Amino acid sequence: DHMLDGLVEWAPAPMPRQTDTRTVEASEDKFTGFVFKIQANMDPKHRDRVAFMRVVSGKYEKGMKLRQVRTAKDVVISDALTFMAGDRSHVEEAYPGDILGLHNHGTIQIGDTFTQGEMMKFTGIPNFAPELFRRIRLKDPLKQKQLLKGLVQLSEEGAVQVFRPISNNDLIVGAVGVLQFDVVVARLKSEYNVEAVYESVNVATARWVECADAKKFEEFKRKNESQLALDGGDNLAYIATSMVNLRLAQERYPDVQFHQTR
Amino acid sequence: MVTIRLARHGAKKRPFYQVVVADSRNARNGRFIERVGFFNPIASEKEEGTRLDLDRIAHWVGQGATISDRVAALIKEVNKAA
Amino acid sequence: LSPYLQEVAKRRTFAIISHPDAGKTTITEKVLLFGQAIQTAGTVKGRGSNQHAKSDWMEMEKQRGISITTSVMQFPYHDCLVNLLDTPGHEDFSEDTYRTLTAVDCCLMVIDAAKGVEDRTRKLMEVTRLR
Amino acid sequence: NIKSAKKRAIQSEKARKHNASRRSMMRTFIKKVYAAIEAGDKAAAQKAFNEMQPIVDRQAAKGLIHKNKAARHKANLTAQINKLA
Amino acid sequence: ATVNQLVRKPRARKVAKSNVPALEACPQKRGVCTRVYTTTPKKPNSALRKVCRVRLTNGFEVTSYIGGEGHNLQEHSVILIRGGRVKDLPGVRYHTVRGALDCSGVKDRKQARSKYGVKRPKA
Amino acid sequence: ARYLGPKLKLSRREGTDLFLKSGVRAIDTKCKIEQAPGQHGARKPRLSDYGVQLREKQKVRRIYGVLERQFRNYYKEAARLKGNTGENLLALLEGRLDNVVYRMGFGATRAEARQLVSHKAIMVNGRVVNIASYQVSPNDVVSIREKAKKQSRVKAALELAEQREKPTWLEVDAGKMEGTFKRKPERSDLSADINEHLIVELYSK
RNA sequence: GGUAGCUAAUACCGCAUAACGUCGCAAGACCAAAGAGGGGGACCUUCGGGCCUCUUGCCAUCGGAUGUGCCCAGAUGGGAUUAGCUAGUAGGUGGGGUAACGGCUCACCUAGGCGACGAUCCCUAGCUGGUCUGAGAGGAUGACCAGCCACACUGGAACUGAGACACGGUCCAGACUCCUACGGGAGGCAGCAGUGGGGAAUAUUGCACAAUGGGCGCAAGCCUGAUGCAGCCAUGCCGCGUGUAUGAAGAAGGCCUUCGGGUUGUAAAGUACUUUCAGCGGGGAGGAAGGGAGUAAAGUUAAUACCUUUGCUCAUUGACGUUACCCGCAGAAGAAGCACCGGCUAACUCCGUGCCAGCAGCCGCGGUAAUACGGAGGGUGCAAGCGUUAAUCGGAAUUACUG
Ligand SMILES: Nc1nc2c(ncn2[C@@H]2O[C@H](COP(=O)(O)OP(=O)(O)NP(=O)(O)O)[C@@H](O)[C@H]2O)c(=O)[nH]1
Ligand SMILES: [Mg+2]
Ligand SMILES: [Mg+2]
Ligand SMILES: [Mg+2]
Ligand SMILES: [Mg+2]
Ligand SMILES: [Mg+2]
Ligand SMILES: [Mg+2]
Ligand SMILES: [Mg+2]
Ligand SMILES: [Mg+2]
Ligand SMILES: [Mg+2]
Ligand SMILES: [Mg+2]
Ligand SMILES: [Mg+2]
Ligand SMILES: [Mg+2]
Ligand SMILES: [Mg+2]
Ligand SMILES: [Mg+2]
Ligand SMILES: [Mg+2]
Ligand SMILES: [Mg+2]
Ligand SMILES: [Mg+2]
Ligand SMILES: [Mg+2]
Ligand SMILES: [Mg+2]
Ligand SMILES: [Mg+2]
Ligand SMILES: [Mg+2]
Ligand SMILES: [Mg+2]
Ligand SMILES: [Mg+2]
Ligand SMILES: [Mg+2]
Ligand SMILES: [Mg+2]
Ligand SMILES: [Mg+2]
Ligand SMILES: [Mg+2]
Ligand SMILES: [Mg+2]
Ligand SMILES: [Mg+2]
Ligand SMILES: [Mg+2]
Ligand SMILES: [Mg+2]
Ligand SMILES: [Mg+2]
Ligand SMILES: [Mg+2]
Ligand SMILES: [Mg+2]
Ligand SMILES: [Mg+2]
Ligand SMILES: [Mg+2]
Ligand SMILES: [Mg+2]
Ligand SMILES: [Mg+2]
């Protein structure tokens, strides 16, 4: 309780967050949140996802209209969660410094800035790239969605992300650090009664997920397609055997990154 | 309570209402007592656009039948004796 | 002192970090009874202090082993409205914790006085000075 | 069930109550007659009948012994009270 | 014969039975497949035909042909049985769909790749 | 939905000039017409009663640019319509705007007659028409886009149009670049290597 | 929620008054109701408003229209390896009952009622208009649309009310589930959308009441996942484009060749040409009718107020919506796949392989030149589809009434 007294006494009220536009004061009106997390959504009766947003400035109110800066599409809000301790709660209206929940349907990512209009994006949020291994090949001898559905639902979350090549089967997953266990465990918890195990897979990279101008890409999506994959979220990626075979791939050139984006 | 209203039997974007006598308690396109004219909210400036058995309409009204606010705006929009 | 800038100033949103098995989740459960959110309390793994009261480690596997991903909390203490995070200890496991720091204006580090400063304690300070 | 016109319930309930007894006295009155009939006193019979005659015609006008339901009662009563008296 | 007869016992059609009745009369079904063997065809033709016994979704267990050369199938697997018989292997009334569920299509196959389930080999 | 390929390759299999390379000089030739529609073109195809029965209509299709799904429909029409389905079907085939175009020589072949109608370069009794399938009633009057009128292409088209069989059911011009559809083509005023009891025969089982 | 008390109404109840109504052959008995508004000359009394008036509402009786009950007949799946079924059962008399006939109920009385024209009993199944097939007769079927019916967690019951035996009402019981401070409470997506689950497989937790239509209201208006739109999916039907012309002894390359050549093939190149549709940019119908404010009407009135009415004037009324559609800019630019080629069956050769590998709808291909396997060339057929599978009618005069 002292450290709490100390907490209340000394610790900052909502702080300014930086953006590629300006120092955003907490004092301002005009709503300005930024997600930051799409928690390991189980969740008792839904895919939900419910993206966790920070609220930098402005007051949120249930029926208000907001703007997803990234996709540049204006969105009306209604069901906007307030988390009473690892538990969804309906729902109120929020002030700077709180944490608000939404409802991810491939619309939200990580670092997705939401304003009331001001087109700008918060310079924060880390988002780094995975290492690898895997091939969940499942006991339960299938199905097949619930496993996959399970995987393409733990993947619009930030931890891991799957990789499904162009051979329907052969499911690859990659790969926070090495705790590929929550996957197995959420493969028989959350809402999927699958079981699943592992193997070793000839994949160093990771990969890195590409796109730019047409035609050239269709020649790329063809030549080194062996070899090329597609993700939960319907794009994109390669999947290489080593570092040399990674360099030569990009070296096919000159069409784009690198790209990780979680 | 017998009323004379319109049923939406047109098509996406291009409606085609149809005046009819029917117990109010019914579905728009539901059980009706009898067709009694139509109304084309399109048609364009050409040869036609509406039709009413006004001499039947008046028959039904004479039996205690209400009219749609829009059905009315037809009846008399097409005059009556000219 | 308008009803807007008043609500803003009385808020306070923070982390809770440390090295795996330090006290995050426990000190959190205790902070929750100082906020009248939990009328009793519990432990971890639902262990040594009996009663099906663990708790507030969201998930499931957490309650089987020990902690997984940031639970988030809002409660009133004294004259304030606290927003509380619960950051996972483990190298490979998070990530997340880092991204969670992006939502906090300040941060509380728990240290095992039986252990002193451990590895991810040192690594967490580096991440802290970033902001 | 969380839907405003659950007052429609407590409302109906009130009426139920009200009706019940109205309807309840309704019959008990008619009864007196049948009694007089299974008892024989034809004077006492018209006696009861006259006092019920109105109290029935009334509840119909109010709408609980509807329409000819009263007619029936008054009718098939008059039909017996003097069938043998 | 007689009309009066027909009036009596009236003529009755002969209902039909599908050569493939592992149920629902539905386009295909999914099954776990219990064994992957090969056997030998009827009198005239000779070879080692590829077949698989398959526990179906509807509970019927039933053997099925594996068309094309070579397949990935084995121990457990999951496939999508199709229908159409195989007159060389009697008791084999179904074909597992190549290139569906746990089934690999034919490696390098370039003609009528639709069947045998293979994707354009990069034009 | 269009053919899009070796137009002569076709005329060699149907063994007739299908008017696919009309343009400047016509009357096939300069392509080995007949004797090699493929790799074995030399062969002497003794084709079945079906063979011809098909080859007939399968020709007619080509010589207009119509496909099956649509052709099938066309037949259904003529059968429902009273009178020799044979000629009826032809009457529908001739009634095509793409046809009333090339027919009125506003384009080289009927493969060029579409590029225009398809590219809003003609009209009917006024309003522009984009569907290279419009059914041209009687008294209708198609007319090259008043806008894009007389161009490097269509100009040279009228040229040989005037030096062709020249119809009888339509009245063309050259400067007003508009014709009328005066009456539906009779059986007598059109033909060639085309049999009806062969194409209608086909659609019967 | 529980006790006590205070208060209004078009809530509730007598009384009065009653016929063209109910009872009664007649005589005579007996029954109803509500007020609230916008105003306004008199006079105005206890100047609340009484009063005049139009407007809306109440009662009673007889009608109209609608809606619903109730009745009879014929017809409406299979099974005789289901041949008998039935005590309120069949009818009568008499009370009661219902809105109404009735076994609907009960009392007593006859001993009946149904059934091979298939009762009973099993199995299946919502019925129809229709739908697919068929030359027809028929066979198959009843998603979407409209009529009828039935159910709304399972079973049961009544209440309220014109109408329910009530999806988002009530009571009881049953199974389940949720909250609980432990004493007690709460709920039913076969409404929209959405999750789980099952399956070869079936959609977004979208927008709006602007139009049509419904409930309340004098009216504005309010409510309306009905409706109107949108999103997703080639699932289909219907349109359309992926270029149009011209082009050589006819390139390279690929393919066959008795090597002389044939063929892919006007195909490509090259040369001219056109830009629908997409992409960017502009302009912009219809779905809009009504309502909201002022003016006139032998409208009624004591009245130019109020109300209604019909013309008139002004401001205004949309979800789709960066609408449909129109016009420019650019450049062949961005858009072809799939099955098939021994016979039925349109469409052929080389090579490999060798009764292996494998095809196959049926016949049948494969053990050394495979038009049948696999690859390649070429060819045929459909085309944003093409194929396989599944299922129905046809071919099947193969349940034949036609036949
Ligand atoms: N003796 C003692 N043990 C304590 C104390 N606080 C926490 N612990 C122990 O620390 C163990 C870890 O508890 P927990 O709160 O999960 O630690 P953590 O820091 O949250 N772990 P993680 O880093 O995985 O999230 C608990 O099981 C508890 O028994 C304390 O004050 N005293
Ligand atoms: Mg912990
Ligand atoms: Mg009310
Ligand atoms: Mg009686
Ligand atoms: Mg089957
Ligand atoms: Mg053999
Ligand atoms: Mg095969
Ligand atoms: Mg055998
Ligand atoms: Mg080939
Ligand atoms: Mg088409
Ligand atoms: Mg029947
Ligand atoms: Mg029977
Ligand atoms: Mg049923
Ligand atoms: Mg026949
Ligand atoms: Mg039927
Ligand atoms: Mg349905
Ligand atoms: Mg209800
Ligand atoms: Mg419900
Ligand atoms: Mg639903
Ligand atoms: Mg759904
Ligand atoms: Mg509306
Ligand atoms: Mg509401
Ligand atoms: Mg709504
Ligand atoms: Mg050569
Ligand atoms: Mg365009
Ligand atoms: Mg308009
Ligand atoms: Mg108009
Ligand atoms: Mg009016
Ligand atoms: Mg607007
Ligand atoms: Mg525009
Ligand atoms: Mg091609
Ligand atoms: Mg074919
Ligand atoms: Mg054929
Ligand atoms: Mg042939
Ligand atoms: Mg083959
Ligand atoms: Mg077949
Ligand atoms: Mg050979
Ligand atoms: Mg071959
Ligand atoms: Mg037959």
Side-chain angles (χ1 to χ4, degrees), chain A, chain B, chain C residues 1-37 39-90 92-131, chain D, chain E, chain F:
Chain A
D1 58 324
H2 320 106
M3 99 89 207
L4 264 189
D5 282 336
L7 194 266
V8 151
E9 190 83 20
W10 308 325
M15 289 295 292
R17 292 284 175 264
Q18 206 54 38
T19 302
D20 52 330
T21 286
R22 60 186 185 84
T23 294
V24 190
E25 300 292 297
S27 53
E28 312 170 18
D29 42 22
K30 288 277 177 288
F31 182 93
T32 315
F34 80 95
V35 201
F36 81 97
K37 188 216 195 195
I38 320 181
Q39 171 242 240
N41 192 89
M42 23 174 331
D43 195 277
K45 309 231 52 200
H46 253 56
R47 69 175 161 178
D48 275 334
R49 312 293 211 141
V50 294
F52 283 69
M53 185 174 293
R54 154 74 205 234
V55 189
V56 175
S57 76
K59 172 185 174 171
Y60 159 77
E61 286 187 299
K62 192 199 282 188
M64 78 187 304
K65 189 163 188 170
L66 304 184
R67 175 84 130 273
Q68 193 169 357
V69 169
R70 179 186 59 87
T71 90
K73 305 304 180 177
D74 277 275
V75 181
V76 173
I77 291 298
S78 30
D79 38 90
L81 280 186
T82 300
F83 304 101
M84 294 301 182
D87 203 325
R88 116 253 120 210
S89 184
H90 244 296
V91 120
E92 302 226 28
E93 36 104 323
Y95 286 91
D98 298 340
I99 297 293
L100 204 64
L102 292 183
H103 265 106
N104 197 182
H105 320 288
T107 44
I108 328 293
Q109 303 173 350
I110 308 300
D112 273 19
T113 297
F114 286 62
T115 67
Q116 292 210 243
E118 186 168 351
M119 296 288 291
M120 56 160 172
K121 198 175 177 304
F122 287 90
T123 177
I125 108 276
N127 282 313
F128 46 71
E131 214 79 275
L132 232 332
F133 88 148
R134 294 281 198 136
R135 256 242 303 185
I136 5 197
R137 54 185 291 97
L138 221 223
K139 298 107 154 284
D140 262 37
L142 311 174
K143 278 197 260 162
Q144 301 158 327
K145 89 243 190 191
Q146 129 231 216
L147 204 293
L148 186 69
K149 159 161 261 177
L151 292 171
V152 188
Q153 275 177 347
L154 295 212
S155 292
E156 293 176 350
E157 158 190 351
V160 285
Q161 176 67 267
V162 307
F163 290 114
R164 46 182 200 176
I166 206 60
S167 71
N168 134 267
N169 245 16
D170 191 20
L171 292 195
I172 309 181
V173 165
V176 247
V178 316
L179 256 282
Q180 327 247 14
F181 297 81
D182 337 281
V183 163
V184 158
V185 176
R187 258 27 95 170
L188 196 20
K189 207 48 253 133
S190 287
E191 280 72 22
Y192 331 109
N193 209 139
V194 261
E195 289 242 306
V197 241
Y198 300 118
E199 260 171 16
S200 289
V201 183
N202 182 246
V203 173
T205 79
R207 318 304 194 181
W208 320 359
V209 71
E210 320 311 327
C211 49
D213 76 325
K215 196 166 310 307
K216 197 283 190 70
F217 204 35
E218 198 60 38
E219 181 75 16
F220 168 73
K221 296 185 61 174
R222 215 180 42 82
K223 295 185 78 178
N224 326 289
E225 189 251 282
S226 312
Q227 280 296 89
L228 277 170
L230 176 142
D231 217 335
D234 254 270
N235 70 327
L236 315 128
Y238 185 108
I239 289 165
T241 187
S242 57
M243 292 298 299
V244 178
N245 197 223
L246 158 67
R247 297 318 171 193
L248 299 168
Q250 299 174 314
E251 174 266 321
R252 259 111 195 181
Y253 253 173
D255 205 63
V256 103
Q257 40 182 178
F258 282 171
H259 212 67
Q260 277 90 160
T261 292
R262 307 290 136 175
Chain B
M1 173 222 301
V2 275
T3 306
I4 301 79
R5 51 185 177 193
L6 274 19
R8 203 204 202 283
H9 295 284
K12 196 161 75 289
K13 301 312 189 175
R14 318 176 74 260
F16 185 115
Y17 306 74
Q18 196 117 14
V19 23
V20 74
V21 186
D23 175 81
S24 40
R25 286 173 314 203
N26 249 132
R28 201 178 59 174
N29 313 320
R31 179 165 86 178
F32 50 72
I33 302 300
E34 56 172 289
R35 191 197 89 257
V36 58
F38 58 84
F39 160 90
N40 192 312
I42 304 301
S44 82
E45 179 194 11
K46 24 69 67 174
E47 305 182 49
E48 188 67 341
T50 307
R51 169 199 176 274
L52 301 78
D53 221 289
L54 323 80
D55 60 70
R56 288 289 297 167
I57 306 283
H59 169 59
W60 269 111
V61 170
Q63 252 71 291
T66 64
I67 264 68
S68 312
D69 47 34
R70 184 52 164 292
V71 154
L74 292 216
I75 311 166
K76 179 58 65 176
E77 194 283 314
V78 79
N79 306 324
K80 183 173 276 69
Chain C
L1 28 70
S2 67
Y4 176 87
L5 53 100
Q6 193 153 353
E7 283 277 307
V8 174
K10 78 158 189 148
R11 267 151 180 85
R12 253 142 268 231
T13 303
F14 311 114
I16 300 190
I17 56 170
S18 85
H19 180 279
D21 305 333
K24 293 204 156 100
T25 326
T26 296
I27 204 174
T28 306
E29 229 234 350
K30 300 319 170 78
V31 155
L32 272 182
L33 56 51
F34 277 108
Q36 294 141 336
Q39 326 293 341
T40 352
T43 24
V44 120
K45 246 213 202 177
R47 253 270 291 206
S49 256
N50 286 318
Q51 317 137 39
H52 203 256
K54 314 196 164 191
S55 47
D56 305 86
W57 227 167
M58 209 294 223
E59 307 262 276
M60 164 70 67
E61 178 200 353
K62 294 194 179 178
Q63 319 182 359
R64 286 168 189 162
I66 191 160
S67 295
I68 271 233
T69 313
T70 328
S71 329
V72 73
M73 274 139 301
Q74 174 183 115
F75 66 93
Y77 175 79
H78 193 249
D79 59 317
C80 289
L81 186 64
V82 183
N83 288 111
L84 179 54
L85 282 291
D86 216 28
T87 68
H90 209 209
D92 328 292
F93 191 63
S94 319
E95 225 348 299
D96 173 273
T97 276
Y98 287 174
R99 286 208 277 254
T100 296
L101 293 181
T102 313
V104 306
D105 313 325
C106 123
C107 183
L108 146 77
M109 180 131 69
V110 196
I111 289 210
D112 193 328
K115 265 107 103 72
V117 170
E118 309 186 70
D119 192 34
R120 223 188 48 96
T121 293
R122 283 185 303 270
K123 299 187 172 191
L124 264 176
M125 283 254 37
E126 178 187 22
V127 191
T128 279
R129 303 188 221 98
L130 269 167
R131 274 179 152 223
Chain D
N1 162 270
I2 302 281
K3 199 281 96 177
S4 60
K6 60 159 154 269
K7 72 166 283 192
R8 206 62 160 97
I10 173 66
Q11 216 163 138
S12 69
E13 233 304 310
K14 188 213 167 199
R16 194 270 300 184
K17 277 178 173 272
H18 183 285
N19 290 142
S21 42
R22 310 305 293 175
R23 206 165 51 220
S24 204
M25 80 153 187
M26 166 82 271
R27 39 198 73 156
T28 50
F29 269 91
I30 308 174
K31 302 255 180 59
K32 306 298 95 174
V33 180
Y34 109 91
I37 316 319
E38 188 171 0
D41 267 6
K42 64 198 66 180
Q46 279 256 318
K47 227 294 182 296
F49 175 100
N50 281 289
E51 189 174 55
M52 56 136 293
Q53 170 182 192
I55 205 184
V56 187
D57 278 318
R58 175 182 311 285
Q59 303 298 170
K62 291 294 168 61
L64 73 73
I65 192 174
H66 260 298
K67 296 157 287 62
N68 34 304
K69 179 161 154 49
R72 298 198 326 246
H73 274 115
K74 50 179 91 311
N76 64 179
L77 257 183
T78 313
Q80 298 193 51
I81 71 91
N82 64 63
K83 207 288 291 296
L84 201 56
Chain E
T2 309
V3 282
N4 200 64
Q5 278 187 327
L6 251 53
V7 168
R8 281 209 202 83
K9 178 204 256 73
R11 302 196 173 275
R13 193 51 162 88
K14 61 145 299 180
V15 189
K17 54 91 183 178
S18 89
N19 178 43
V20 285
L23 189 61
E24 294 186 355
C26 55
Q28 40 277 149
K29 301 236 69 171
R30 175 193 46 187
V32 182
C33 109
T34 313
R35 318 272 167 173
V36 179
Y37 293 179
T38 65
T39 63
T40 65
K42 302 174 61 167
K43 303 72 71 280
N45 304 164
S46 173
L48 269 59
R49 267 58 189 303
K50 279 64 185 185
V51 285
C52 70
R53 274 168 64 194
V54 170
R55 174 163 298 290
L56 268 197
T57 235
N58 46 21
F60 295 79
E61 185 171 315
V62 62
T63 91
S64 179
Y65 197 32
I66 328 286
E69 311 178 57
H71 61 61
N72 69 289
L73 272 358
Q74 61 176 308
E75 282 293 62
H76 290 276
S77 305
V78 178
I79 47 80
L80 193 68
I81 181 270
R82 164 162 55 71
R85 85 164 184 145
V86 186
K87 77 149 257 44
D88 244 24
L89 302 303
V92 171
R93 294 191 276 188
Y94 308 116
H95 292 274
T96 79
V97 173
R98 281 318 273 274
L101 288 34
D102 257 45
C103 179
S104 176
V106 194
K107 178 164 63 178
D108 310 324
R109 225 297 211 318
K110 301 191 178 304
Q111 254 174 154
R113 295 180 331 264
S114 183
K115 343 163 159 186
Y116 314 88
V118 189
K119 303 170 190 168
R120 299 245 297 186
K122 330 179 189 72
Chain F
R2 293 270 149 270
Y3 173 39
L4 270 56
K7 40 180 175 65
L8 281 323
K9 197 174 183 273
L10 267 166
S11 295
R12 303 211 292 170
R13 174 67 76 192
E14 309 291 333
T16 315
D17 188 29
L18 310 174
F19 301 70
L20 307 183
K21 196 257 186 83
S22 292
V24 188
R25 32 78 151 269
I27 329 295
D28 55 21
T29 327
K30 293 73 62 161
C31 72
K32 276 75 165 261
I33 189 77
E34 161 61 56
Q35 305 172 57
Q39 188 265 71
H40 290 288
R43 278 255 60 86
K44 179 196 303 180
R46 300 176 176 175
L47 83 175
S48 74
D49 191 335
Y50 172 67
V52 305
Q53 189 184 341
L54 162 164
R55 230 69 210 66
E56 186 59 42
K57 85 110 172 101
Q58 185 74 160
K59 162 218 305 304
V60 172
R61 282 180 62 197
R62 303 328 317 166
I63 192 190
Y64 275 70
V66 173
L67 289 193
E68 268 287 15
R69 201 80 291 170
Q70 208 171 188
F71 206 119
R72 298 288 197 85
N73 295 178
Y74 273 137
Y75 167 103
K76 292 184 295 183
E77 200 56 286
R80 181 204 78 201
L81 302 175
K82 184 175 287 73
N84 187 39
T85 312
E87 58 199 42
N88 290 74
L89 177 72
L90 287 192
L92 281 277
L93 269 167
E94 213 70 63
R96 278 177 78 80
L97 191 167
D98 54 282
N99 185 72
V100 195
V101 159
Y102 161 102
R103 225 64 182 168
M104 291 174 175
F106 306 156
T109 169
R110 265 171 292 225
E112 183 173 292
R114 292 220 186 92
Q115 175 105 139
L116 299 177
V117 199
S118 165
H119 292 186
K120 282 170 187 167
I122 46 66
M123 339 171 109
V124 282
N125 297 311
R127 289 79 62 180
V128 43
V129 173
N130 184 31
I131 63 278
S133 161
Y134 183 85
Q135 198 55 36
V136 193
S137 306
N139 288 20
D140 284 40
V141 291
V142 66
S143 29
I144 301 268
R145 262 296 183 174
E146 195 172 47
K147 281 64 56 188
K149 264 180 180 302
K150 48 177 64 182
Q151 238 55 49
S152 188
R153 202 243 315 279
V154 57
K155 217 308 167 59
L158 281 179
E159 173 189 48
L160 33 286
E162 147 270 309
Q163 194 178 172
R164 207 203 297 117
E165 307 182 49
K166 208 281 283 61
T168 311
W169 56 101
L170 39 73
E171 318 158 31
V172 73
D173 202 88
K176 192 157 43 193
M177 314 187 68
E178 72 181 46
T180 298
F181 203 79
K182 181 176 56 183
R183 46 85 174 176
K184 300 182 175 189
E186 288 296 297
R187 192 60 196 90
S188 52
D189 51 43
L190 54 76
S191 183
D193 307 41
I194 57 181
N195 298 293
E196 313 81 72
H197 82 71
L198 254 193
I199 174 279
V200 188
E201 212 163 291
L202 203 65
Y203 297 3
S204 289
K205 24 74 184 309

